[PDB]
Amino acid sequence: KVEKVFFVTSPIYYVNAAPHIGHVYSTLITDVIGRYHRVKGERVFALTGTDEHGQKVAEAAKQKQVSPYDFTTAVAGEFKKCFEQMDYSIDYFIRTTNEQHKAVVKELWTKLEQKGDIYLGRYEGWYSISDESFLTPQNITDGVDKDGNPCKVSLESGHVVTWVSEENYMFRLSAFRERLLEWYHANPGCIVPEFRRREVIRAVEKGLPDLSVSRARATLHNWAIPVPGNPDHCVYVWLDALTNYLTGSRLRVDESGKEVSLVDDFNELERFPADVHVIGKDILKFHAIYWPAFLLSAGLPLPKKIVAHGWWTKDSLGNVFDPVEKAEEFGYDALKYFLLRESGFSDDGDYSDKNMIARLNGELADTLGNLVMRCTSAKINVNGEWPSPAAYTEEDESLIQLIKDLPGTADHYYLIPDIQKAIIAVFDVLRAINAYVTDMAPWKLVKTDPERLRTVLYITLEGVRVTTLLLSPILPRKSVVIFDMLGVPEVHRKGIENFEFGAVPPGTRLGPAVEGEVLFSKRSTE
């Protein structure tokens, strides 16, 4: 197609409470996608951040008896600390309190208004403050609040809903039904997974109401962006929030990660529109309906892909999963592996300690770690080098073919994107490499047929190198330890050139050994 910066985003999270696993998972997926495109040698801009305005946040700050400025700044700081500890490679962390962001929101608003797509009207209806979401009466039901009093709750989330009757600026969303439908039909990969795409089409097929994009300022505790030309109104937190993707695309960022300039025209930085928006299923409508509608109105290009995973962007009754405690217990790369291996586009995942140990011991230690140790062992690799292969048998070639096919396959999965499938494909090949090794018994060959061992060892090292390269966006620190052990030069650790079989030449020396070297140490079953 065209050469631009591959632009991948995560949602920006409400700062009403501390960061937790949902946020870490969403930002993980964004990080992995970005990392894979970097190892393909593409330019990448990965974006994450915090949603800091609105009633929900203001009221959370009121509950803690602190000013919104101090509260948002403190919780935003917790998010940054958390993501730093998680060892992501995110290019920029945006906050909607940022002054440049507010300028962008005002430019976008003025466009919608000049286009004729904003009018003064009224919203009279249900609203979820916890989700900052307007709801029809079909999407609420009966429940209770903390006081046990009967109340209405959202069908979507189970949060308490309230009736709102306000003069509001309205966006003409109803006018964009046909164009949104055209967009879904013409780009059948634009929403992932496919069943969520089908949900969006059905919802839009039914018809769209107009959307309130302002609120009376008192309702918001004056914690929002004023509407241009009307200081009695505040911009809807979601229109403000979605705009973070446009803002991010227009920020020049220095080496320490501070924003230093806002460009006038997004084309200047070549990021917009996003190639992938990573979201949780709870915020699908905002990204797949509202967002493209605003862009169509403003005449901005639309995103290429929205991927909605099965977790809730935001969710205690005596049940905890602390990301850092787990990572300090089992390792950071292992935890990341586990989260991405275990969960597809569903809540069907088993996140017990029992299952974590099984995958750690089974896949990372027994399948991958053991293979790395065998092909670098002094016992088997007596000369500590990549040997030069002799002639290949049919069995050799069957394995070589699997290895040559693997890049093209994982690449497709990464681009869906479906990271779980990309992992399963790589491990299928690791399993095949192990079976080959068992078959050939290279420990026996050292004594018996040194020439045969050359071939078997070479194919093993090259299968390990390639699988590891493809696993490196998922296991960034361990992929480095593995490449060091194999003695793979830095240049061969990225680029599509190095997807090819045979990229590291024979005679390459292995890295230095360490006594009792741990790649993935097993954990007892308790």
Nearer to ligand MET, 13 or 413 (CB): 13
Listed residue (109, 219, 220) closest to 169, CA to CA: 109
Nearer to ligand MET, 308 or 423 (CB): 308
**Closest residue to ligand MET using C-beta atoms:** 51
Q: Is the peptide bond before 193 cis (omega within 30 degrees of 0)?
A: yes
Nearer to ligand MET, 117 or 240 (CB): 240
Nearer to ligand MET, 96 or 343 (CB): 96
Nearest approach, Cβ of 210 to ligand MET (angstroms)? 20
Nearest approach, Cβ of 487 to ligand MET (angstroms)? 44
| Contact residues for ligand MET, defined by CB under 6 A | 11-14, 51, 241-242, 244, 283, 313-314
Nearest approach, Cβ of 247 to ligand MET (angstroms)? 11
Secondary structure (H, E, C), 438-501: HHHCHHHHHHHCHHHHHHHHHHHHHHHHHHHHHHCCCCHHHHHHHHHHHCCCHHHHCCHHHHCC
Nearest approach, Cβ of 241 to ligand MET (angstroms)? 4
Burial annotation 104-141 (CB, 10 A radius, 16+ → b, else e): bbbbbbebbbeeebbeebebebbbbbbbbbbbeeeebe
Nearest approach, Cβ of 103 to ligand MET (angstroms)? 17
Count CA atoms within 13 Å of residue 20 on its CB side: 15
Residue that is written with structure tokens 């009736």 in the block? 163
Nearer to ligand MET, 51 or 333 (CB): 51
Q: How far lies 229's CA from each of 113, 149, 416, 486, in Å?
A: 11, 41, 43, 64
47, 84 contact by CB (below 8 A) = no
**Partners of residue 337 on adjacent β-strands:** none
Nearest approach, Cβ of 51 to ligand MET (angstroms)? 3
Nearest approach, Cβ of 313 to ligand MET (angstroms)? 4
Listed residue (489, 488, 440, 484) closest to 460, CA to CA: 440
Which SS3 state, helix, strand or coil, does residue 128 take?
strand
Nearer to ligand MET, 169 or 290 (CB): 290
Nearer to ligand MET, 308 or 474 (CB): 308
